[PDB]
Each structure stands twice: as structure tokens, then as C-alpha cells.
Curated annotation (Swiss-Prot), chain A:
GO terms for MF: DNA binding; DNA-directed RNA polymerase activity
Subcellular location: Cytoplasm; Nucleus
Physiological role: DNA-dependent RNA polymerases catalyze the transcription of DNA into RNA using the four ribonucleoside triphosphates as substrates. Common component of RNA polymerases I, II and III which synthesize ribosomal RNA precursors, mRNA precursors and many functional non-coding RNAs, and small RNAs, such as 5S rRNA and tRNAs, respectively. Pol II is the central component of the basal RNA polymerase II transcription machinery. RNA polymerases are composed of mobile elements that move relative to each other.
Gene name of the encoded protein: RPO26
Principal location: cytoplasm
Record's keyword annotation contains Cytoplasm: yes
Region (Leucine-zipper): 41-62
Subunit structure: Component of the RNA polymerase I (Pol I), RNA polymerase II (Pol II) and RNA polymerase III (Pol III) complexes. Component of the RNA polymerase I (Pol I) complex consisting of 14 subunits: RPA135, RPA190, RPC40, RPA14, RPB5, RPO26, RPA43, RPB8, RPA12, RPB10, RPC19, RPC10, RPA49 and RPA34. The complex is composed of a horseshoe-shaped core containing ten subunits (RPA135, RPA190, RPB5, RPO26, RPB8, RPB10, RPC10, RPA12, RPC19 and RPC40) where RPA135 and RPA190 form the DNA-binding cleft.
Note: Present with 6090 molecules/cell in log phase SD medium.
Whole sequence portion shown: 71 to 153 of 155
Source species: Saccharomyces cerevisiae (strain ATCC 204508 / S288c)
Name of protein: DNA-directed RNA polymerases I, II, and III subunit RPABC2
UniProt entry tagged with the keyword Phosphoprotein: yes
Keywords assigned by UniProt, alphabetized: Cytoplasm, DNA-directed RNA polymerase, Nucleus, Phosphoprotein, Ribosome biogenesis, Transcription
Family under the similarity heading: Belongs to the archaeal Rpo6/eukaryotic RPB6 RNA polymerase subunit family.
UniProtKB/Swiss-Prot annotation, chain B:
Keyword Nucleotide-binding found: no
Function text: DNA-dependent RNA polymerases catalyze the transcription of DNA into RNA using the four ribonucleoside triphosphates as substrates. Common component of RNA polymerases I, II and III which synthesize ribosomal RNA precursors, mRNA precursors and many functional non-coding RNAs, and small RNAs, such as 5S rRNA and tRNAs, respectively. Pol II is the central component of the basal RNA polymerase II transcription machinery. RNA polymerase complexes are composed of mobile elements that move relative to each other.
Main localization of the protein described in the UniProt heading: nucleus
Gene that encodes the chain: RPB5
Name of the protein in question: DNA-directed RNA polymerases I, II, and III subunit RPABC1
Cross-referenced PROSITE patterns: RNA_POL_H_23KD
Swiss-Prot/TrEMBL keywords: DNA-binding, DNA-directed RNA polymerase, Nucleus, Ribosome biogenesis, Transcription
Organism from which the protein derives: Saccharomyces cerevisiae (strain ATCC 204508 / S288c)
Disulfide bonds: none
Swiss-Prot record, chain D:
Subunit structure: Component of the RNA polymerase III (Pol III) complex consisting of 17 subunits.
Note: Present with 6020 molecules/cell in log phase SD medium.
Function comment: DNA-dependent RNA polymerase catalyzes the transcription of DNA into RNA using the four ribonucleoside triphosphates as substrates. Largest and catalytic core component of RNA polymerase III which synthesizes small RNAs, such as 5S rRNA and tRNAs. Forms the polymerase active center together with the second largest subunit. A single-stranded DNA template strand of the promoter is positioned within the central active site cleft of Pol III.
Gene name per UniProt: RPO31
Protein name listed in UniProt: DNA-directed RNA polymerase III subunit RPC1
Family per similarity comment: Belongs to the RNA polymerase beta' chain family.
Length: 83, 215, 49, 49, 146, 48
RNA sequence: GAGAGGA
DNA sequence: CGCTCTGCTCCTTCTCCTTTCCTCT
DNA sequence: CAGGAGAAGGAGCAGAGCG
């Protein structure tokens, strides 16, 4: 039920394609709602491209709650996840 | 006549070997030389003067081994008896269950010959402490566990089941159940709620373990 | 393995006669006798009356 | 004559296995959290890669 | 480590007892296959070496001559021939192992995959292309099959 | 009377001996008597 | 509503 | 020792399904 | 308009016990 502490977390340290797509979608939804960005914009306007560029530099400020079937859940930061 | 009697003798010998190995791999004490009994020995020690299958002598009692009684504290001796009358009815089954009760046996295996009256089946599952099981002689000719398509089953104790449930964080109602009266389940005689671990072999994946429970 | 079947009456009774030809039994090396055929008929008379 | 039968078979086959997911404990499970496989295919390897 | 069903550790004498198999068996088999493949390559190199004078050093040499070159007495001409025929480098072996391990850790069913839908489609869609072809039971024309 | 199954299994249409490769042979049966086929002598029950 | 392409 | 329930097992006669839709007319 | 597969009642016997 409680969050599994960071010291031991069985869930894979990798970033699944579903998690990557969901992170990009959430970050693009936030940016489309006039949210600050943490990358050099370079003139891009479509929020999805800005989200992709942020994920390229690991600048997306989100974490993943991987819900195990029992009920517990490991919180994995996007920065720590590998691609 | 001669051919029918000899065929029945050979079939009974194969059935007796199957029964011996079934009571062996459950954890009881038999010797490999006892199960590996040549047909000549079966004729010599389990037949009358004129050579007919008499079942009153081949019935036996088996007791657990030290390791199996350590793994399973609650496992008493069992009494394997055959029958003389083909159409087993209420009377013979009642005599057998009375004998089981008076002999202080935890379980008994009744290998009926040809047919079981449904009244006997009704009387079968009425014993609180002990239990009895029915095996057709035709159903025991080649043991199921030695077929090519039957993977290795293992009976898991309470401690092993608890370890498995804690490891996978599951419950007793989520594992892939195996029905009671399943031919590889009643072979091991799994009681309701006992986990069996299956060493399943596939050509693309080697061996791996899959777990089931008896329901 | 019947090789013929006949129905024969008598003065006050009737019956069915079938003579199993042992030649075909030997040539087919089947492991059965007259008693085996008779007991098979009696046991499979479930379909019959 | 085969198209309709194949379509129906595919429909019902999908209706059976509609909700099976590889959970984060590496066990294929159904919607009701009833574990059908303890590891996908015995190795947990996706055939796509 | 292959913990037993009771939670204890196998005593190194019954690891392959066929009653203690569990998950991570596929990974051990894959590692054994990798080791077997590298052993086959090294054995091929050693068998080439022993065919041209140089002793095949598949088994590790003793420490009584570990610090010295084990083939200095051999003429340098055959050394070049063996090198140009079969040469296995440290970088090549490390790169092969890294690539194999990366492609293995990549080739795992990622959690959350809708594996049920994938399986149902993979079993149903080929049915849409299974045109009825008449077959028999492996050379027996009479024994018709479906 | 001339249709009662005298010998065999009354659930089998036919049985044909087939010759496998490398000289082996086995019997292919059209019917539903698997348990009886495994039980009857002359065959190996572990592979049927 | 039901007649027929169509892929 | 036939007689009389139960119970089982056939046997017959019943019910619910048959891609995708994509148009026009 | 065909094909497939179950659920529900008659119906004909074994089986058990009996006064």
C-alpha cells in the first residue's frame, strides 16, 4: 500500500514505450495550457515537439507511479529512467 | 480360460505396479525392487494353486518416510485394498469403510475391479477424519505421470505455499486452479487448497515452473 | 468372423445358429475363442434385448 | 465463404483475451487480477523484438 | 541464486535437481548459450593454432610461465598467418557481450503491454489467410485429416 | 446379431498401420478410444 | 425499408 | 422375495450465434 | 434459409432396502 522506498525497487529501471508516450502526452498537455518550458524553444510552437525536445534533455518534471498488482507502487523520476 | 486368465493376470500386475508407484511418489515407503516386480513373481506370490487373480493377499499397508513425514506432519498410513466382486455396491464399500475406521487409517485407496454402484460413491465422502479414493483397474494400467504430455507435478506443503504466496504477493484465490478429480491431481491425491508446482518443458523456453491449486 | 447366420425352428422351440469359421480367425491371428465371442455377445447385448 | 467465419473467429478470440496485461511484477494477468501466467511464454520475451 | 520453494538456498549439489527450477532459468540458459558460443569460437581459434605449430592454449597456462610470452620460440611467419586467419580481440569480445546483453535486456515484454490483444490478433488474423489446402497424414492418402 | 463388436474397441472406425521414416512404423486409429489404446498391450502408453 | 455494385 | 422409490443415464426436443462497412436508390 | 450446442423434461432400467 505504502510507497516502496527508493533504496530497493524491483520494477525495471528502463522506461517502457507506454510510459514514454504517456509522459510526452502529459507534458504536451501541460505546455498547451501555457506552462513554462525548460529547454531552448528554438521557435517551435506545437506543444508535442516542445515535449519531445524536453524529453530529449531529460527536463520533463514528472514522475511515474508504477502500480504493482498487490497495491504498492514505486515512484520513478523521469530523469532517473533510461532510454 | 487360459488366455483370458493370463491376460487378466498381466493386467493386474501392471495395475499393481502403477498403484505401488502412485503410493511411492506421494511420500510413502516402498523399495524400488518391490515396485519392479517381474510378472513371474506376481504369479508366484499373488495367485492361487490353479492360477487365478486373488486380491485378498495383494492388499497392503504403506507408512510414510522420515523426510516426507518431516515435510508433512499430518500424514498417516494408508491401506490399499482391491475388490473381489466386479460390481462394487453399498455393502462391500460399507465393509471397507468400517474396516478403515476400525483400523485407524488416515486414508484408504479402493481399487474397484469393473464398476462402482452410485450408492457406494454417495457413501465414499462421508468420513470426517479420514478419506477414501476410488481407482478403476482399467484406469490404472499405465500411470499418467509417465506419459509424454504430463509434466512433472510436485506437491507443495503449507510452508512452501506460504512462501510462494508471499513471493508473488498473491492469494489462494488467484493462482491458476486445477480441478479436483483431475487425473494428475487425484493421482497425487491433492486435497482442496494444496498448491502443486509444475515443471513445464517447452522447446522454445526450456523448463519453467507454473503453479496450480486444487479446487 | 460369422461366415453365415441362420434362424432354425424346432417342434416347440427356435434359435439362431452362427458357425464361426476358425480359418478366418487363424488367418487374422485374432486372440479370441468361442467362449470369448459368446461372452462378448452377452456383454454387448446391451444394445440388444 | 471463409471471410465471414474468419472474422467471427477473430472477434470471439479477441473477446476472450481482451484484457490481459504484463504487470510490473512480470506476470500476465487478467482484469480481475487473476494471474494466468507467472511469466509470459516462460521467458518474458516479447516476440516483436 | 535459485532459492528453494521453502525459501532456503540450494546446496550447490542439487541445483539441477529439476525440482528447484523457477524464474530466471531462461536467463541462466541464455548466459550458458552465450558462454558456449564464445567457447566454440575460442576452440576454433585453438584448433587452428595447433594445426600450425603453436600449441593450443584453450586451457589457461600455469603461473610458472604466465608472465613470459608462451610462443616466443615460434617463428614469426606462422604467427602472422594465424593472426590473419583467426584473430579475436578484447574489444571484439567485449563489444559482442555488450551487444548481446543489451539486445537481451531490450527484448523483454515491457510492463503494461496489451499482450492479450496482441496474442488474439496474432492467432486470428492468419486464419483470414488460411485458404483451404487439401492435406493428408504424412504420406497416408487414405487417412484424411482436417 | 451380425454387428456386435466381438473383439476390439466399439468406438473406432478403422485402424491402419503406417510406416514412418527410418523404418519405424505405428498404427493410426480413427476413433475416441485413447484410454483403451493406451491400456491394451503391444503398445507403449507413454507415447500415444 | 430492402436491390445491387464496391474494396 | 417380488415390490416400490430413488437415482442415473439416455434420448428427444427444444434455443442463440454466422466481418468489415460503404455507398446509392 | 442452414449448421452447432447447450438446458430441460420423459423414459427405461439398476440398485437399494423391505415386511
Amino acid at each position: 500500500e505504502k510507497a516502496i522506498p527508493k533504496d530497493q525497487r524491483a520494477t525495471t529501471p528502463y522506461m517502457t514505450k507506454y510510459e514514454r508516450a504517456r509522459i510526452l502526452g502529459t507534458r504536451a498537455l501541460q505546455i498547451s495550457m501555457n506552462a513554462p518550458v525548460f529547454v531552448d524553444l528554438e521557435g517551435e510552437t506545437d506543444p508535442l515537439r516542445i515535449a519531445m525536445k524536453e524529453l530529449a534533455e531529460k527536463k520533463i518534471p514528472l514522475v511515474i507511479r508504477r502500480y504493482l498488482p498487490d497495491g504498492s507502487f514505486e515512484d520513478w523520476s523521469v530523469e532517473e529512467l533510461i532510454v | 480360460m487360459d488366455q483370458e486368465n493370463e491376460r487378466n493376470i498381466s493386467r493386474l500386475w501392471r495395475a499393481f505396479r502403477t498403484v505401488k508407484e502412485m503410493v511411492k511418489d506421494r511420500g510413502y515407503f516402498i523399495t524400488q525392487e518391490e515396485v519392479e516386480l517381474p510378472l513371474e513373481d506376481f504369479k508366484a506370490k499373488y495367485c492361487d494353486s490353479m492360477g487365478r487373480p486373488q486380491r485378498k493377499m495383494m492388499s497392503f499397508q504403506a507408512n510414510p518416510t522420515e523426510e516426507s513425514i518431516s515435510k508433512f506432519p499430518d500424514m498417516g498410513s494408508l491401506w490399499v485394498e482391491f475388490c473381489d466382486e466386479p460390481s462394487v455396491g453399498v455393502k462391500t464399500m460399507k465393509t471397507f469403510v468400517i474396516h478403515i475406521q476400525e483400523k485407524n487409517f488416515q486414508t484408504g485407496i479402493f481399487v474397484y475391479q469393473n464398476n462402482i454402484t452410485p450408492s457406494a460413491m454417495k457413501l465414499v465422502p462421508s468420513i470426517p477424519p479420514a478419506t477414501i479414493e476410488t481407482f478403476n483397474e482399467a484406469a490404472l494400467v499405465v500411470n499418467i505421470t509417465h506419459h509424454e504430455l504430463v509434466p512433472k507435478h510436485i506437491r507443495l506443503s503449507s510452508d512452501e505455499k506460504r512462501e510462494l504466496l508471499k513471493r508473488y504477493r498473491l492469494k489462494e484465490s488467484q493462482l491458476p486452479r486445477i480441478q479436483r478429480a483431475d487425473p494428475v491431481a487425484l493421482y497425487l491425491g491433492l486435497k482442496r487448497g494444496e498448491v502443486v508446482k509444475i515443471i513445464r518443458k517447452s522447446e522454445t523456453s526450456g523448463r519453467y515452473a507454473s503453479y496450480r491449486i486444487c479446487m | 468372423v460369422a461366415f453365415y447366420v441362420q434362424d432354425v425352428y424346432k417342434d416347440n422351440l427356435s434359435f439362431i445358429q452362427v458357425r464361426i469359421d476358425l480359418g478366418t480367425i487363424d488367418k487374422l491371428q485374432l486372440e479370441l475363442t468361442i467362449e470369448d465371442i459368446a461372452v462378448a455377445i452377452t456383454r454387448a447385448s446391451k444394445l440388444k434385448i | 465463404v471463409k471471410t465471414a467465419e474468419t472474422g467471427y473467429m477473430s472477434r470471439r478470440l479477441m473477446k476472450s483475451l481482451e484484457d490481459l496485461s504484463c504487470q510490473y511484477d512480470n506476470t500476465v494477468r487478467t482484469s480481475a487480477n487473476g494471474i494466468v501466467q507467472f511469466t509470459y511464454g516462460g521467458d518474458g520475451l516479447d516476440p516483436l523484438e | 541464486v535459485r532459492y528453494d520453494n521453502s525459501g532456503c538456498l540450494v546446496k550447490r549439489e542439487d541445483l539441477n535437481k529439476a525440482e528447484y527450477v523457477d524464474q530466471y532459468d531462461a536467463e541462466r540458459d541464455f548466459y550458458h548459450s552465450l558462454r558456449e558460443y564464445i567457447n566454440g569460437k575460442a576452440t576454433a581459434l585453438a584448433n587452428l593454432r595447433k594445426s600450425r605449430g603453436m600449441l593450443g592454449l584453450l586451457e589457461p597456462p600455469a603461473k610458472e610461465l604466465q608472465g613470459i610470452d608462451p610462443d616466443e620460440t615460434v617463428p614469426d611467419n606462422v604467427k602472422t598467418s594465424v593472426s590473419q586467419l583467426y584473430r579475436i580481440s578484447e574489444k571484439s569480445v567485449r563489444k559482442f557481450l555488450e551487444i548481446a546483453l543489451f539486445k537481451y535486456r531490450k527484448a523483454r515484454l515491457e510492463p503494461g503491454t496489451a499482450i492479450g490483444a496482441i496474442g488474439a490478433q496474432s492467432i486470428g488474423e492468419p486464419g483470414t489467410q488460411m485458404t483451404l489446402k487439401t492435406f493428408h497424414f504424412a504420406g497416408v492418402a487414405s487417412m484424411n485429416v482436417t | 446379431l451380425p454387428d456386435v463388436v466381438v473383439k476390439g474397441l466399439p468406438d473406432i472406425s478403422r485402424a491402419v498401420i503406417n510406416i514412418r521414416d527410418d523404418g519405424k512404423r505405428e498404427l493410426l486409429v480413427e476413433g475416441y478410444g485413447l484410454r483403451d489404446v493406451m491400456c491394451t498391450d503391444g503398445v507403449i502408453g507413454s507415447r500415444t
